[PDB]
Amino acid sequence: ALRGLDTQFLQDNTALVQAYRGLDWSDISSLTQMVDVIEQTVVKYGNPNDSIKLALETILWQILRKYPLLFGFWKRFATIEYQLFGLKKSIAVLATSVKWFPTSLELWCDYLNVLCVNNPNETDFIRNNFEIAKDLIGKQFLSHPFWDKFIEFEVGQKNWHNVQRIYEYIIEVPLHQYARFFTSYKKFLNEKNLKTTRNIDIVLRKTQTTVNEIWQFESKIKQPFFNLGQVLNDDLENWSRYLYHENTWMMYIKWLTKKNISDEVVVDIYQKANTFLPLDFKTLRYDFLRFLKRKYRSNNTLFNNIFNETVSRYLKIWPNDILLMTEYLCMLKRHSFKNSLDQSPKEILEKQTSFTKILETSITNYINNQIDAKVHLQTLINDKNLSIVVVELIKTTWLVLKNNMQTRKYFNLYQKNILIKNSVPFWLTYYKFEKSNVNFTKLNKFIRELGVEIYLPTTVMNDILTDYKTFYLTHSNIVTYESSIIDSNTFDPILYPELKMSNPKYDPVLNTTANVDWHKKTEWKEAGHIGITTERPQISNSIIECNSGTLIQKPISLPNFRNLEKINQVKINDLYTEEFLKE
Amino acid sequence: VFIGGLSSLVTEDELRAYFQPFGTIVYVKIPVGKCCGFVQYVDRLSAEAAIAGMQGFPIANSRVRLSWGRSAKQTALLQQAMLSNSLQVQQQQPGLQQPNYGYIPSSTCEAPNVSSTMLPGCQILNYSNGQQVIMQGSEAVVNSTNAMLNRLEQGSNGFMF
Amino acid sequence: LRNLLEKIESSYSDNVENVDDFEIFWDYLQFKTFCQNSLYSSRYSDSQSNGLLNKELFDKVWKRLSCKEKKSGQEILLNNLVQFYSKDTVEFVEKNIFQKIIEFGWEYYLQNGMFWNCYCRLIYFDTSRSYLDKRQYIVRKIWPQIDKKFAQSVLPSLTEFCESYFPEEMDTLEEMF
C-alpha cells in the first residue's frame, strides 16, 4: 500500500540489473515479479509503464512484450504513448504483421483518436499505411481524421491537400464541408482546452487535478451533445479520471442514459469503473446493481451472469453488508425459476419446494463448514449474511407453502445458533409470525426477553415495544390482560413497554436488600460525574432522616465515619488511551 | 463516547441503530481493524444517558465496554505526540454559548412549512441528521411513527439492518 | 380510564377525529379500543376480538379518513386496519374501506404507495387463502386497478412489497408501468 516503497524497490532492482552489467536471471525475474506485483497493486501511470516496457524490451521477449502492451492498455483510456509504443512495436512483426498492425491501429483509433492530443496517432497510422501500397487506405484514414476536431487539424488538411497530389479533389464538397465543421467545433472547444492547458500542472493543488476546468469542459460536452459526443464524453471522462473523484463517473452515468447509447457500451463503463474506483466508496456500485436489475426487464442471461459475478465480487470486498445477499437471493429466486402464474398448480409448488430444499441444504452445509462449489450460493453465504438466508427460508416456508409446524420447528432449530442468535430480520420475522397467529403468550415472552437474552439494537427495540403496545391495545381485552400478569415479577403489556423503551437492561426487580448492599455500587461512586469513580466520605450513622422532634428522647451518638481517607483519591480507568492510543 | 470491545463484525449503520434513541448524533467514525469505535452526540446529557444506558451490552455476542474518549482530529493530535512523547496538551470541546430558550436537550427530530406558537411545552428548535430545524409537534409524532412502521417492513425482509 | 376518555372526547365536542394534532386522536383511539374489546363480546369467528372494526369506532376511523390531505394521520391509521389476519375480517376490511375508497375514487389515496402496499399485505397475510389464489388475486385484480399515471408514485412503495415477497412475478409488475 506504500507507493514510494514500491518505487524505491523498482529503482533499486533495475539499478541492480543494470549495475550488475549482466542479465542476472535472479535480478531479472525479481524485477519482473516486482513490476507485476506493483501493477496488480496500483493503476500504473504512464511513466512507470514506459520504464517497465523499456526494461522488458531491453531483455528482448516478444510475446511477453505483446502481453505487457495489452496490460498497459488495460489501465488507461487516453494514452497515445502506449499505443504509439505498440505501433512502433508491432511495426516490426512476423507473418501476421500486415493484419496485426492494422488491428492495433484500428483499435487505438477506436479509443484515443477523438482526443485533442491524438494527432500523432493519425500521423503514425498514415505513415504505416504510406509505408505500403495501401494508398487507398491512406485516403480513407485522411478522410476519417478530417471529420474530427483536432489541435493540428489545419496542418493535417494542408498535408492531405499536399500528399493528395494524385486523387486530391476527388470529393471536394464532402471533405471541405466536414473539414469546415470540424474546424468550427475545434474553435468552439478551444476555450475549454485553453482553460485546461492554462490550469493543469503539478503543484500538489487543485490546479494539478484541474477539477474546475474539467467540470466546465464536461458540462459543455454533455449539454452540447452531437455525433461522436458519446466518444467525446468518454474521452473527456477518461482524461478527467487520469488526473479517483467518482462524481465524474457519477456525472457520466446520467450522460449515457440521456444520450441513449446501447446497454453494451454502458455496462462496460461500470465494469471498468468498479475495478478502477477505490473500494469503500460504494455508491455507483449499488446503482450498478440497480442498473442490472432494471435492464433485466428485457430478459438476457448476460445480465444475470454480470449480476451473479458482480455480487460475488462486492460480497468479497464488503462482507458485512447484508443488502447484497437480499438482492442476490431475490435474483436467484427470479431468474432461475420464473413461474409467471400461467403454469399448472402442481408445477409452481414444485418450483417453490425445490428452492426451499436448495436453501435449507445450503444453510445446513454453511453451518457445518461444508462447501459445495456446484451451488453458487455456498460461496456467497457469510457468517453475517446467513441470517436473511434462514429468514427467507422461514418466509417461503410459512407464506408460500402455508406450512406452520415446519416453520415453528425452524424457529426453534435456528433460535439457538450463535450467528443468527442476534438478528434484526430473524426476530422481526418471528415478531410478524407471532403477530399473524394472534397468541399473545409467545409474544409477551418475546418482548420481556428482549433486553435480557435476545439482543437487538435499541432503535429496533423501541420499535417492537411501541408497535406491540399498539397491537396489544387494539387486539386484546381486559379479561386477557389482568390474567396475564404473574405478579411474582412486575410485568404488564401496556405499561412495561413504556418503562423499558430507552432501557435495554431494565429489570423490574422488587427487593429490600438492595438497600443493604447500597453505596458500594458504581452508580453511587459516580453520581454527579460519570465514568469517574470517586470514593466519597460519608457519616456511617446519619441523623438527617430523623426529625428533631424524635431526637430529644435520647442523646445522639457520636458520628461514625467511613471512606474518610479517600477524599482526595479519585480514580479513572482510562479506556480511551490504553485500548486505543496504546493498542 | 468511546465504545470499546466491539465484535468488528458490526457495521456503523448498526451502531447508529444502537445509539440513535439516546439523542441526536453528530457522528465521527468507526476505525477499521481496531475493533473499537466511538460516537458523538450534541448534548452531554444524551452522552451520559448512553453511557449509563448501555454498559456491558453485548453487540454480536461481545460484551461492550465503553467510556469517555476524544474525536478523530484530537486523536490525531494525540497520536503524533505518542510517538514523540512531548506534551499532549488537550483542547476542550466548544460550548453552545448558553442561553438557549428554544432547545430541549436529549431530543430527536425523526424526519423533516412551520409557523408555531413557540410555547414552552413544545420543542421549538432541534437538530437534523448539519441543519437547525424548527420542530412541529403535531407532524413529528406522525413522521416518527411512519418511519417506525416502515422500519419494521423493511427490517423483516433484509433491506434495513 | 374510560371516564377520562369520556372527558377528553367531551373536550372536542365529541369530534376527536377532526383534531389537528394526531397523537391525541391516536392515543385516545387505541385505549378506547382496548376498552370496547372488553365491553362487547367478539362478533367474529376464530374468537378474534373486533378491536378497530366496530360501528362506534369504525365510523370514527372512516370520518378521519374522509378528510384526505387536510388531516395528518392518514396511513398510520390505515396500517393498523391490516392487522386482522383472518377470513371474516379480511373480507370486512376488504369491502368496507379498500373497496369503497376505490369506488369513491379519491386521488390522494390512489396516488399513495402505502395504500396499495397495505392493500396487498392485507390479502397476502390472510390465513384462509392458499398461495395460488393469493398471488393470483393480488396480480389479476389488485394491481390492474392502478392507473398508469399514478405509477411513478405508486411503483417505489409497491415494488418493495413485490421485491421481497413475489420475486417471480416482478416482471409482470414492470410491464404494467
Short mmCIF file of all heavy atoms in Angstrom, two decimals, chain A residues 16 45 54 92 132 165 190 192 219 232 247 259 261 297 313 322 362 396 432 454 467-468 482 520 569, unseen atoms left out:
data_model
loop_
_atom_site.label_atom_id
_atom_site.label_comp_id
_atom_site.label_asym_id
_atom_site.label_seq_id
_atom_site.Cartn_x
_atom_site.Cartn_y
_atom_site.Cartn_z
N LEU A 16 20.02 -2.60 -9.95
CA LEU A 16 20.78 -3.82 -9.70
C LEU A 16 21.00 -4.61 -10.98
O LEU A 16 22.08 -5.20 -11.17
CB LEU A 16 20.07 -4.69 -8.66
N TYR A 45 0.59 4.55 -13.73
CA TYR A 45 0.60 5.75 -14.57
C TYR A 45 1.65 5.61 -15.67
O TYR A 45 2.60 4.84 -15.56
CB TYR A 45 0.86 7.00 -13.73
N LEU A 54 10.33 -0.43 -21.39
CA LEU A 54 11.71 -0.30 -21.84
C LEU A 54 12.58 -1.42 -21.26
O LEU A 54 13.45 -1.96 -21.95
CB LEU A 54 12.27 1.07 -21.43
N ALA A 92 7.39 -3.89 -36.25
CA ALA A 92 8.36 -4.94 -36.58
C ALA A 92 7.77 -6.26 -36.12
O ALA A 92 7.65 -6.52 -34.92
CB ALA A 92 9.71 -4.66 -35.94
N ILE A 132 3.22 1.17 -47.15
CA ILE A 132 2.75 0.16 -48.08
C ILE A 132 2.26 0.79 -49.38
O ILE A 132 2.48 1.98 -49.64
CB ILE A 132 1.63 -0.69 -47.45
N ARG A 165 -1.75 14.72 -54.03
CA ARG A 165 -1.47 15.22 -55.38
C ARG A 165 -2.00 14.31 -56.49
O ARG A 165 -2.13 14.77 -57.63
CB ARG A 165 0.04 15.42 -55.54
N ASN A 190 -11.86 25.24 -28.25
CA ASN A 190 -10.55 25.84 -27.97
C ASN A 190 -10.57 26.61 -26.66
O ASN A 190 -9.52 26.79 -26.03
CB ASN A 190 -10.13 26.75 -29.13
N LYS A 192 -12.39 25.73 -23.87
CA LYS A 192 -12.30 24.76 -22.79
C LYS A 192 -10.91 24.15 -22.73
O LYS A 192 -10.34 23.98 -21.65
CB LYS A 192 -13.36 23.67 -22.98
N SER A 219 -19.29 19.77 -18.58
CA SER A 219 -20.60 20.41 -18.67
C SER A 219 -20.87 20.87 -20.10
O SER A 219 -21.94 20.61 -20.66
CB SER A 219 -20.69 21.58 -17.70
N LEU A 232 -16.70 11.54 -27.42
CA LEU A 232 -16.11 12.73 -26.84
C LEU A 232 -16.35 12.77 -25.33
O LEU A 232 -15.49 13.22 -24.57
CB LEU A 232 -16.66 13.98 -27.51
N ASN A 247 -17.66 11.51 -8.58
CA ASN A 247 -18.77 12.30 -9.08
C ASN A 247 -18.57 12.67 -10.54
O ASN A 247 -19.50 13.19 -11.17
CB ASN A 247 -18.97 13.55 -8.22
CG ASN A 247 -20.30 14.22 -8.46
OD1 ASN A 247 -21.28 13.56 -8.83
ND2 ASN A 247 -20.36 15.53 -8.25
N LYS A 259 -28.22 10.36 -23.52
CA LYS A 259 -27.88 10.33 -24.94
C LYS A 259 -28.28 9.01 -25.60
O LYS A 259 -28.18 8.90 -26.83
CB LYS A 259 -26.39 10.58 -25.14
N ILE A 261 -27.27 5.52 -25.52
CA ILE A 261 -26.30 4.60 -26.11
C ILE A 261 -26.62 3.21 -25.60
O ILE A 261 -27.10 3.04 -24.46
CB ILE A 261 -24.85 5.02 -25.75
CG1 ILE A 261 -24.54 6.40 -26.33
CG2 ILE A 261 -23.85 4.02 -26.29
CD1 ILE A 261 -24.64 7.51 -25.32
N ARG A 297 -35.32 -6.27 -17.42
CA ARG A 297 -36.67 -6.23 -17.98
C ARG A 297 -36.73 -6.90 -19.35
O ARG A 297 -37.65 -7.67 -19.64
CB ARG A 297 -37.15 -4.78 -18.07
N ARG A 313 -18.18 -10.40 -6.39
CA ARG A 313 -17.05 -9.54 -6.05
C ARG A 313 -17.37 -8.62 -4.87
O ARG A 313 -16.60 -8.56 -3.90
CB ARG A 313 -16.63 -8.72 -7.26
CG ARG A 313 -15.48 -7.75 -6.99
CD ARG A 313 -15.11 -7.00 -8.26
NE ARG A 313 -16.21 -6.20 -8.76
CZ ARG A 313 -16.28 -5.71 -9.99
NH1 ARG A 313 -15.31 -5.94 -10.86
NH2 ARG A 313 -17.33 -4.99 -10.36
N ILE A 322 -25.45 -6.61 4.41
CA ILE A 322 -26.49 -7.63 4.29
C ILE A 322 -27.39 -7.42 3.07
O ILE A 322 -28.08 -8.36 2.65
CB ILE A 322 -27.33 -7.66 5.58
CG1 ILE A 322 -28.24 -8.89 5.63
CG2 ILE A 322 -28.15 -6.39 5.72
CD1 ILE A 322 -27.50 -10.19 5.73
N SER A 362 -28.45 -25.54 1.72
CA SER A 362 -27.37 -24.57 1.65
C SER A 362 -26.94 -24.12 3.04
O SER A 362 -25.75 -24.15 3.37
CB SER A 362 -27.78 -23.37 0.80
OG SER A 362 -28.82 -22.63 1.42
N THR A 396 -40.53 -18.20 3.01
CA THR A 396 -41.05 -19.06 1.95
C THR A 396 -41.79 -20.26 2.52
O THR A 396 -42.82 -20.67 1.97
CB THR A 396 -39.91 -19.51 1.04
OG1 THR A 396 -39.32 -18.37 0.42
CG2 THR A 396 -40.42 -20.46 -0.03
N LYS A 432 -43.45 -10.89 13.32
CA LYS A 432 -44.56 -10.86 12.38
C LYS A 432 -45.29 -12.20 12.34
O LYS A 432 -46.50 -12.24 12.11
CB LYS A 432 -44.05 -10.49 10.98
CG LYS A 432 -45.13 -10.29 9.95
CD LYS A 432 -44.53 -10.05 8.57
CE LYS A 432 -43.80 -8.73 8.50
NZ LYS A 432 -43.19 -8.50 7.17
N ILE A 454 -32.28 -11.95 24.19
CA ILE A 454 -32.20 -11.77 22.74
C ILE A 454 -31.81 -10.33 22.45
O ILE A 454 -32.60 -9.41 22.67
CB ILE A 454 -33.54 -12.11 22.09
CG1 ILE A 454 -33.90 -13.57 22.35
CG2 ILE A 454 -33.51 -11.80 20.60
CD1 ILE A 454 -35.34 -13.90 22.08
N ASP A 467 -44.80 -0.81 18.63
CA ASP A 467 -45.74 -1.46 17.73
C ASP A 467 -46.51 -2.57 18.44
O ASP A 467 -47.69 -2.80 18.14
CB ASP A 467 -45.00 -2.01 16.51
CG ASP A 467 -45.94 -2.65 15.51
OD1 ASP A 467 -46.79 -1.93 14.95
OD2 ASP A 467 -45.81 -3.87 15.28
N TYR A 468 -45.86 -3.27 19.38
CA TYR A 468 -46.57 -4.28 20.15
C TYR A 468 -47.47 -3.66 21.20
O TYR A 468 -48.49 -4.26 21.57
CB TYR A 468 -45.58 -5.24 20.80
CG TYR A 468 -46.26 -6.16 21.79
CD1 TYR A 468 -47.09 -7.18 21.35
CD2 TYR A 468 -46.07 -6.01 23.15
CE1 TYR A 468 -47.72 -8.01 22.24
CE2 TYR A 468 -46.69 -6.85 24.05
CZ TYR A 468 -47.52 -7.85 23.58
OH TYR A 468 -48.15 -8.69 24.47
N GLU A 482 -55.59 -8.86 32.59
CA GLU A 482 -55.32 -8.98 34.02
C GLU A 482 -54.95 -10.40 34.41
O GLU A 482 -54.34 -10.62 35.47
CB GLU A 482 -56.53 -8.51 34.83
N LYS A 520 -21.82 0.68 47.80
CA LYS A 520 -20.68 0.02 47.18
C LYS A 520 -20.86 -0.09 45.67
O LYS A 520 -19.99 -0.65 44.98
CB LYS A 520 -20.46 -1.37 47.78
CG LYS A 520 -20.13 -1.35 49.26
CD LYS A 520 -18.78 -0.71 49.52
CE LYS A 520 -18.46 -0.70 51.00
NZ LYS A 520 -18.33 -2.09 51.54
N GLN A 569 -8.66 10.90 46.86
CA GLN A 569 -8.41 9.79 45.95
C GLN A 569 -9.55 9.72 44.95
O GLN A 569 -10.70 9.44 45.32
CB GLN A 569 -8.25 8.49 46.73
#
